[PDB]
Design a protein around this ligand. Structure first.
Ligand code: CL
Ligand code: CL
Ligand code: CL
Length: 162
């Protein structure tokens, strides 16, 4: 397993514009297009992202390409964030993947706000961090996915994805 396969499992793959769990226009492997309620604003962002007139539909290669960009960008954003970088650097490879997963879903800002959990993760208090992570909108809104990520931070293994 690796970050790519992990995200592929959590986000799925859809080739036509769809709405995410929050109601936002997305495509591919969890590539958010816009928070705007307009399908037209979404198709336009799509064409700009792809470099062609898509008419709201992309190929598998294009979805994969967006995904590669988004993972890279997620990871690099973590290294550039003063609150996240130190946590990431302290983690082992498996847990690093868990933190990238949360940043991919919720944005760097969102994650950077889990101050207490980040502190427990850096201290390697796994069970305590698992408990704290769960007291969040994140966990209540997407319980299945959050548990998978939480178990990942707790155990340092990919068991939840097997
Ligand atoms: Cl893009
Ligand atoms: Cl460095
Ligand atoms: Cl879920």
């Amino acid at each position: 397993m690796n970050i790519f396969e992990m995200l592929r499992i959590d986000e799925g793959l859809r080739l036509k514009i769809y709405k995410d769990t929050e109601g936002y226009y997305t495509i591919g492997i969890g590539h958010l297009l816009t928070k705007s309620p307009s399908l037209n604003a979404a198709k336009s962002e799509l064409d700009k992202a792809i470099g062609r007139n898509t008419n709201g539909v992309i190929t598998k290669d294009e979805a994969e390409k967006l995904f590669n960009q988004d993972v890279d960008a997620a990871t690099r954003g973590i290294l550039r964030n003063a609150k996240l970088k130190p946590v990431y650097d302290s983690l082992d490879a498996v847990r690093r993947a868990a933190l990238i997963n949360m940043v991919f879903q919720m944005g760097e800002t969102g994650v950077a706000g889990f101050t207490n959990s980040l502190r427990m993760l850096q201290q390697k208090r796994w069970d305590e961090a698992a408990v704290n992570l769960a007291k969040s909108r994140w966990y209540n809104q997407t319980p299945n996915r959050a548990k998978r990520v939480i178990t990942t931070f707790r155990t340092g293994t990919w068991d939840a994805y097997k």
